[PDB]
Design an enzyme around this catalytic site. Structure first.
Site, PDB file in Angstrom:
ATOM      1  N   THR A 145       0.830  -1.200   0.000  1.00 50.62           N
ATOM      2  CA  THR A 145       0.000   0.000   0.000  1.00 50.62           C
ATOM      3  C   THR A 145       0.865   1.252   0.000  1.00 50.62           C
ATOM      4  OG1 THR A 145      -0.161  -0.019   2.414  1.00 50.62           O
ATOM      5  CG2 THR A 145      -1.826  -1.227   1.188  1.00 50.62           C
ATOM      6  N   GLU A 169      12.073  26.531   2.786  1.00 51.86           N
ATOM      7  CA  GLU A 169      13.494  26.794   2.965  1.00 51.86           C
ATOM      8  C   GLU A 169      14.324  25.551   2.669  1.00 51.86           C
ATOM      9  OE1 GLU A 169      15.070  29.667   3.983  1.00 51.86           O
ATOM     10  OE2 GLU A 169      13.256  30.889   4.178  1.00 51.86           O
TER      11      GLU A 169
HETATM   12  N1  LIG Z   1       8.988   2.657  11.961  1.00 46.40           N
HETATM   13  C1  LIG Z   1       7.900   1.895  11.924  1.00 46.40           C
HETATM   14  N2  LIG Z   1       7.731   1.008  10.884  1.00 46.40           N
HETATM   15  C2  LIG Z   1       6.629   0.225  10.835  1.00 46.40           C
HETATM   16  C3  LIG Z   1       5.659   0.302  11.814  1.00 46.40           C
HETATM   17  N3  LIG Z   1       4.687  -0.582  11.510  1.00 46.40           N
HETATM   18  C4  LIG Z   1       5.016  -1.209  10.360  1.00 46.40           C
HETATM   19  N4  LIG Z   1       6.227  -0.726   9.941  1.00 46.40           N
HETATM   20  C5  LIG Z   1       6.973  -1.092   8.730  1.00 46.40           C
HETATM   21  O1  LIG Z   1       6.110  -1.318   7.637  1.00 46.40           O
HETATM   22  C6  LIG Z   1       6.670  -2.311   6.810  1.00 46.40           C
HETATM   23  C7  LIG Z   1       5.597  -3.065   6.033  1.00 46.40           C
HETATM   24  O2  LIG Z   1       4.564  -2.187   5.648  1.00 46.40           O
HETATM   25  P1  LIG Z   1       3.221  -1.932   6.494  1.00 46.40           P
HETATM   26  O3  LIG Z   1       2.971  -0.458   6.673  1.00 46.40           O
HETATM   27  O4  LIG Z   1       3.254  -2.674   7.807  1.00 46.40           O
HETATM   28  O5  LIG Z   1       2.136  -2.584   5.514  1.00 46.40           O
HETATM   29  P2  LIG Z   1       1.721  -1.728   4.226  1.00 46.40           P
HETATM   30  O6  LIG Z   1       2.794  -0.730   3.888  1.00 46.40           O
HETATM   31  O7  LIG Z   1       0.400  -1.031   4.434  1.00 46.40           O
HETATM   32  O8  LIG Z   1       1.558  -2.854   3.093  1.00 46.40           O
HETATM   33  P3  LIG Z   1       0.502  -4.050   3.253  1.00 46.40           P
HETATM   34  O9  LIG Z   1       0.895  -5.054   4.315  1.00 46.40           O
HETATM   35  O10 LIG Z   1       0.405  -4.746   1.922  1.00 46.40           O
HETATM   36  O11 LIG Z   1      -0.812  -3.412   3.605  1.00 46.40           O
HETATM   37  C8  LIG Z   1       7.468  -3.214   7.731  1.00 46.40           C
HETATM   38  O12 LIG Z   1       8.690  -3.546   7.122  1.00 46.40           O
HETATM   39  C9  LIG Z   1       7.742  -2.377   8.956  1.00 46.40           C
HETATM   40  O13 LIG Z   1       9.117  -2.102   9.030  1.00 46.40           O
HETATM   41  C10 LIG Z   1       5.823   1.190  12.862  1.00 46.40           C
HETATM   42  O14 LIG Z   1       4.962   1.257  13.734  1.00 46.40           O
HETATM   43  N5  LIG Z   1       6.947   1.990  12.916  1.00 46.40           N
END
Ligand SMILES: Nc1nc2c(ncn2[C@@H]2O[C@H](COP(=O)(O)OP(=O)(O)OP(=O)(O)O)[C@@H](O)[C@H]2O)c(=O)[nH]1
Ligand SMILES: Nc1nc2c(ncn2[C@@H]2O[C@H](COP(=O)(O)OP(=O)(O)OP(=O)(O)O)[C@@H](O)[C@H]2O)c(=O)[nH]1
Ligand SMILES: Nc1nc2c(ncn2[C@@H]2O[C@H](COP(=O)(O)OP(=O)(O)O)[C@@H](O)[C@H]2O)c(=O)[nH]1
Ligand SMILES: Nc1nc2c(ncn2[C@@H]2O[C@H](COP(=O)(O)OP(=O)(O)O)[C@@H](O)[C@H]2O)c(=O)[nH]1
Ligand SMILES: [Mg+2]
Lengths: 409, 426, 50, 427, 426
Positions: free
Chosen positions: D135, D244
């Site tokens: 996503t 900036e």
């Molecule tokens: N820094 C940080 N990274 C996160 C967190 N939650 C998920 N991630 C990162 O998000 C990555 C995967 O993407 P997600 O946002 O969890 O899922 P998505 O991007 O929506 O993609 P889908 O699973 O297909 O829906 C993982 O490798 C995590 O490192 C968070 O709370 N903090």
């Protein structure tokens, strides 16, 4: 100054049953309504629900007219056979309602053209009202059948045969579909399972917003004679798209910041029209904007400027000043059990364009297909009609299509 | 206001009508002794459509039992809701026809039809605004079919403007009780096409099949089958008796489902119908009612509608429901199954909603499809009729009673031209 | 597919949604600036004349 | 002046849940939306005393969105803002970019339009996404494409989460990162990297939290954003805006990738025993033990650096401190740039939220720099992406969705070309 | 919104599914009557995936039972949580195949499978957004293997764009209940490699081994085996039903674990699974879950992965956990034992956490590994198939029903090239 309201049919008096509930809940300003009404129908079942309802004592017993037996979705039956015995009693009452009155602005009629009573004796009532008064305005807020959502089968026959008289009898005709209103309640009101009651409640909101100028003092008042000039550029082009804003729930209303600029916009998107048609295909001939409540003339003035400078919608080449504004001070009231939240200000827009030319063309094929094989025609002919009036009503809508195409150019 | 006079003929008509007046009397809250004992106000103001106030709160039905054998009358008078009829309305011959259409139509009817007409007239003008008559009979028997058919013709001569409903069962070869079924049914249809206003066709195959498959009854006696037919008849005239968000009387349904004057043979279905063991494993929604409605294995005739096309269709709903769901469901079935519907007619479905459910239920529905699959039975009958009549089987039992050979040929002619017009409009 | 492609190329050709109003309002403001400048130049010339 | 913040994906809207939490606790608004004028950049006022955030949460899976609909802030967010799909892209860039993306991004666009119309002096947008997912990667790049054609001149601050070198949760994430950067390159104006292992090490060593969940990660990210928008929200002795950074930090229209850091990330106990002043936090912002991306600027050369200062900070010592950094020789700047710093001081200290593990510090520094160590991370991604691509592993899922082999090779050589670009500017 | 329709075939499928519906319903707080009696509002938010509300708290499972002998159907309605299934979902033949894959796939399937398809259609259209189908069956029997596999093929050509899980126990020489096990397994696997999206290999031998050492049960009846299998199925689809810090849906798992369209046979394990004697001496942290997860003596197949190489692996964690700990444990087990992992794919393990533990434990996990060692089963089964087919043993029971000899040779070739193609990527 007073204006009396007539309600015909199963749809007419149910709309009235919600409309009068709003009038009593809203209220010298009352003088224009207090009721100056008449319910009339051929089936006694819905009228006698009012006679035993909560508003037993509110309506004078004679007012509620009721026939003996229904027209049964039969325009000919409700116009030639059964209408002939009840219409005389109805209009010979409405006369003494007008004699009670002194400064009659006009009449306003509520009917659905799909049925037999709403369509047949609707036109019959209209024809004797036009020959009796002529000059006094008769606003007809009708309910046309939707393209894809439908409850009856012979309604194309009724809708064409009713329209042939709705042209040259009513003065200002507002279309209202059911699919468009269903979409409104689904989209904005987020009601996924609506019934007829919710539809009738927001129909009453539109009616109240266009008569509030007579009832209450505003910054810029507008009478029923004003719509007569400012929106109909030709004597046979009076068919108005309707819209309203903000149609909004109880929680969303507080979250959003309702103002004058965005509701003037929201009243112009096809996602908020009361009739299932896309005005992007058409060109606006004239627009009319009723503002209620907390409105200063500046921001309404600024809002019509932004609409004119946008290019997502276009106007006819004839009108640089294609608007008619109107401002009233009292905000819209709410009904307990209703779904619309209290708002400081609301907008009811009534426009005129060539998008309406699409609905008639869409209507033509459905009527044309059935008529070619002479489906259901034997019911109407044995009632008292002939093949003459079917074909001649057909060619009347053909003329109207060419008329809209000519004026739109 | 609007008035429904009831007329029952023959053994089939009497027993179907007995179960009918049981369920209507319970709906209006009338006791087996004839006095009002209901609870809601709504049940009082519309009992004149079916009853007459006599004296001391005695509400007697507006019905006429009619037959030629006393076994049915005594069985009617014996059981409950048997002491609510006026004994003067039990118009009753004495000899009996016995599965001979000629006896019930020329010889024995000639001395009974005078007395029934006297009673039905006095019972008709007793009320003010007649809506129509309601007849329940068969097409296989003699005193039901023949006398009832003759009564239909005489009534349509006197009252030509008033409506007319006929719940008639037709014979089928899979459930064949008498031997002269084709000889009777063919002649009976010849009179029904010109006299009735609309005929809701029934059959025992579909009824027995429904109680086997859907109801899953073990021993489906005539009581349960007559109970189902009565539930259909109550559903078709619920609009007059109760207020609703959209009303549809008898005439309203007739004009929306009959596109041509001779095309007035319907198929009927009732919903919801569920086994007693599975009544609590289900929801009660409009989509559930629609899936059970449009099932071809749910018509109460032995004619599969998917063997042809629907010309029109009707759905009478009862209960607190949203009209939008009603129209969306009808539109959905109109688009997905596009081949089974006629093309030069859009909107083949009329719908209506009443606000009072039948007693014991939350939401019900009645389906009336005017399809072109009904022509299979007329062919299914005419092939049997020709099988006998090519060789004059059983013919003398009717010939020595007045029918000549031209009458049977005329019945074949009307049957054949009818099946061609259904085939034409498909 | 072909209509989708024409939609995307026309979408890129409009140069954005807000583009038309900005170009329209910019040329209008430009009209005002030249009018203002012309007045000051006239004043200097007429002052020189006296 | 206004800036709106959009969140895409599971990681995106979780980050937003910490940001808007921090915002209301800073401006004294209860979670229901009413006060018991500087809030105008983020909250629009209904006029009935209710404040609504300028944000839209959107993703493809309804799970993470609907706990938000029922948390404490059910009444803060307008319902239409919290967009939600019906089924997930499932760690598949193509599925988020062509199959399922094409239905959801148009709804997001006609929403974001009236957020901008309610605004008057829009400074820009700022987007939150993690490139490892489908996503945030797929429709994120698609959304950035359509945003560039709509506005163009407006800033788009991309705070992206790149996959960590060694710590990873998915297996097809190398494919997703390369294809996403191919479009994130020419759309985002200013793109900030936020790794996950670096934040993990900060919470382990600095915050001395040995068992951190995602909550603490999102908490400190909101702290950096708060430190970056304080200059826009509040008045200071020397302020900068969001326009900036567009000029002062990116020398070439394709080199926009910044290393972020923040100081001091200090637990509740070190602060009591330790001293805060401007010089030591100016030092602590540069050491690689406090960076948010696993790379070492000691291996790279700086182009230009930026320094946010919050709290009781005078301007004389920020100048003296940055002077001491330039005279040191552990880090060096590019030959073409004699001056490599963009400093800024603002009066308001960072507020604290109850339940967080950040102490109440008297002063703080948020550093945002640009370097060439970022070139090593991109190269490190190329080794393991190319590792599997030759044998065509996992390619069948993306090509089955409607893509082909062409876009892998052409996206691969574009980011490969970027590698050569970084090496030639460093010389 | 995301929805799973469940299908159970044969005797093996019915007991597995029976204990499965008890475990899920108990998680959602629904009593044997089928009415809601839970406390937390969180349990109601995600019951659309497995249940339908009927009326008055009545929740019915979205499952279809399909078999050929009524002993299994009556054994299901007798036990607890037996009164919750809709009786119409018991689609059911009468004759019986009896460990004859040809009888299960050509004779009795040809008249039962239209019925089971019609039930599945209603169950699929009753809901809005399909996530996939879930089929539990065996590979040794006839009414599960042949009929169930035909159902899989028919469904895959109907809805080709939806996922599909199949949990299948496979035969082995040490647990040899029937005699024609290889003739059934080889033909069944031939159809599974070309139709199913992903399969989860099981066996009864490993389950018996688990119940001996880890559970230390005295009398491991089939109830406990079905208990382990049910816990696995609940563990994998927990992500759709409950929110968590890192959610991983079925499609997300499929694309992350299947590198090539033919390599979709997984071995599964579940933790924690400890005896009551040692459950008191244990601790609940992430490292103790991992080193009991990745143990070879905890896999639910008799295919020791260290005799092969890991392509990819996955762990689904449940309970309030720290995601840093989750990732570092997967990193540790991949760095130390680097030889057991594939080389041209770094970070071979997909990981996810959900914030709702199963009842009775504080923290749990579920392992799904796609190794290449699964080929031990294919060679192990194909040699027994060859040993009979070289000599035409038991063949006439297959031949005389419609199958010819090239079906066995084609099935042999496809199984043989499959184990060959696993070996090449190894
Ligand atoms: N820094 C940080 N990274 C996160 C967190 N939650 C998920 N991630 C990162 O998000 C990555 C995967 O993407 P997600 O946002 O969890 O899922 P998505 O991007 O929506 O993609 P889908 O699973 O297909 O829906 C993982 O490798 C995590 O490192 C968070 O709370 N903090
Ligand atoms: N908006 C709205 N429309 C209604 C309502 N009731 C009926 N209609 C419309 O009325 C049309 C049919 O006419 P009806 O009003 O129901 O019946 P009628 O006009 O009195 O004609 P008869 O049935 O012969 O008595 C349908 O197409 C409905 O769309 C209502 O309560 N609200
Ligand atoms: N549904 C129903 N059908 C009946 C009943 N009694 C008779 N029939 C049907 O009527 C047909 C015979 O009609 P019959 O009773 O001889 O009519 P009659 O002699 O004219 O009164 C048979 O095919 C029966 O199936 C009944 O009580 N219920
Ligand atoms: N785990 C488990 N396996 C079972 C159970 N019942 C039968 N089986 C397995 O089913 C296999 C034989 O298949 P069978 O039940 O005859 O399949 P069917 O005839 O097609 O339904 C044996 O190898 C058993 O291991 C059970 O309750 N649990
Ligand atoms: Mg009516």
């Amino acid at each position: 100054r007073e204006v009396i309201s007539i309600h015909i049919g199963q749809a007419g008096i149910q709309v009235g049953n919600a409309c009068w509930e709003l009038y009593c809940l809203e209220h010298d300003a009352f003088n224009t309504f207090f009721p100056r009404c008449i319910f009339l129908d051929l089936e006694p079942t819905v009228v006698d629900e009012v006679r035993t309802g909560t508003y037993r004592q509110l309506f004078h017993p004679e007012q509620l007219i009721s026939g003996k037996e229904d027209a049964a979705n039969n325009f000919a039956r409700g116009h030639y056979t059964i209408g002939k015995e009840i219409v005389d009693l109805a209009l010979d009452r409405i006369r003494k309602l007008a004699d009670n009155c002194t400064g009659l602005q006009g009449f306003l009629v509520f009917n659905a053209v799909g049925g037999g009573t709403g369509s047949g004796l609707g036109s019959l009532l209209l024809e004797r009202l036009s020959v009796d008064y002529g000059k006094k305005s008769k606003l007809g807020f009708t309910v046309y059948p939707s393209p894809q959502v439908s409850t009856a089968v012979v309604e194309p026959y009724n809708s064409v045969l009713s329209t042939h008289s709705l042209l040259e009898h009513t003065d200002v005709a507002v279309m209202l579909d059911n699919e468009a209103i269903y979409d409104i309640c689904r989209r904005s009101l987020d009601i996924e399972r609506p019934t007829y009651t919710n539809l009738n409640r927001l129909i009453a909101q539109v009616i109240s917003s266009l008569t509030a100028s007579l009832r209450f003092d505003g910054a810029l008042n507008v009478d029923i004679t004003e719509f007569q000039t400012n929106l109909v550029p030709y004597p046979r082009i009076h068919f108005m798209l309707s819209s309203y804003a903000p149609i909004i729930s109880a929680e969303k209303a507080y979250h959003e910041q309702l103002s004058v600029a965005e509701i003037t916009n929201a009243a112009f998107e096809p996602a908020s029209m009361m009739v299932k048609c896309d005005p992007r295909h058409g060109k606006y001939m004239a627009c009319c904007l009723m503002y209620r409540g907390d409105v200063v003339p500046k921001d309404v003035n600024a809002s019509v400027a932004t609409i004119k400078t946008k290019r997502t919608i276009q106007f006819v080449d004839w009108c640089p000043t294609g608007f008619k504004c109107g401002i009233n001070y009292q905000p819209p009231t709410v009904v307990p059990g209703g779904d619309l939240a209290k708002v400081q200000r609301a907008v009811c827009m009534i426009s005129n364009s060539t998008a309406i030319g699409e609905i008639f063309s869409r209507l033509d094929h459905k009527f044309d297909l059935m008529y070619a094989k002479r489906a259901f025609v034997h019911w109407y002919v044995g009632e008292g009609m002939e093949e003459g009036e079917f074909s001649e009503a057909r060619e009347d809508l053909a003329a109207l299509e060419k008329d809209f195409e000519e004026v739109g150019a | 206001m609007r008035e429904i006079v009831h007329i029952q003929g023959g053994q089939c008509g009497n027993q179907i009508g007995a179960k009918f007046w049981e369920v209507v009397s319970d709906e209006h809250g009338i006791d087996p002794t004839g006095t009002y004992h209901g609870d809601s106000d709504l049940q009082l103001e519309r009992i004149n459509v079916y009853f007459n106030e006599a004296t001391g709160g005695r509400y007697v039905p507006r019905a006429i039992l009619m037959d030629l054998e006393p076994g049915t009358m005594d069985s009617v008078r014996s059981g409950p809701y048997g002491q609510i009829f006026r004994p003067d309305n039990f118009v009753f011959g004495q000899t009996g026809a016995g599965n001979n259409w000629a006896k019930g139509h020329y010889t024995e009817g000639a001395e009974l039809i005078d007395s029934v007409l006297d009673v039905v007239r006095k019972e008709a003008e007793s009320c003010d605004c007649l809506q129509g008559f309601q007849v329940c009979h068969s097409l296989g028997g003699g005193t039901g079919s023949g006398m009832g058919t003759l009564l239909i013709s005489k009534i349509r001569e006197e009252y030509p403007d008033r409506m007319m409903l006929t719940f008639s069962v037709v014979p089928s070869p899979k459930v064949s009780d008498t031997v002269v079924e084709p000889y009777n049914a063919t002649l009976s249809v010849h009179q029904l096409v010109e006299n009735a206003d609309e005929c809701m066709v029934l059959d025992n195959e579909a009824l027995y099949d429904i109680c086997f498959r859907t109801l899953k009854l073990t021993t489906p006696t005539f009581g349960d089958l007559n109970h189902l037919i009565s539930a259909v008849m109550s559903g078709i005239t619920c609009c007059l008796r109760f207020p609703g968000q959209l009303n549809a009387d008898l005439r309203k349904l007739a004009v929306n489902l009959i596109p041509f004057p001779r095309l007035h043979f319907f198929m009927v279905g009732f919903t919801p119908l569920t086994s007693r063991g599975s009544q609590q494993y289900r929801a009660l929604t409009v989509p559930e009612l629609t899936q059970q409605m449009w099932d071809a294995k749910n018509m109460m005739c032995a004619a599969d509608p998917r063997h042809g096309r629907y010309l029109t269709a009707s759905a009478l709903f009862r209960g607190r429901m949203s009209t939008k769901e009603v129209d969306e469901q009808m539109l959905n079935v109109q688009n997905k199954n596009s081949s089974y519907f006629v093309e030069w007619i859009p909107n083949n479905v009329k719908s209506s909603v009443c606000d009072i459910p039948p007693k014991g239920l939350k939401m019900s529905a009645t389906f009336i499809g005017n399809s072109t699959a009904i022509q299979e039975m007329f062919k299914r009958v005419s092939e049997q009729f020709t099988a006998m009549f090519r060789r004059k089987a059983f013919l003398h039992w009717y010939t020595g009673e007045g029918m000549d050979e031209m009458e049977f040929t005329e019945a074949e002619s009307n049957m054949n031209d009818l099946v061609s017009e259904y085939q034409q409009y498909q | 597919s072909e209509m989708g492609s024409t939609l995307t190329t026309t979408r890129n050709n409009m140069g954005g949604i807000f583009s038309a109003k900005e170009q329209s309002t910019a040329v209008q403001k430009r009209i005002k600036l030249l009018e203002n400048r012309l007045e000051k130049a006239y004043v200097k010339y007429n002052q020189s004349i006296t």
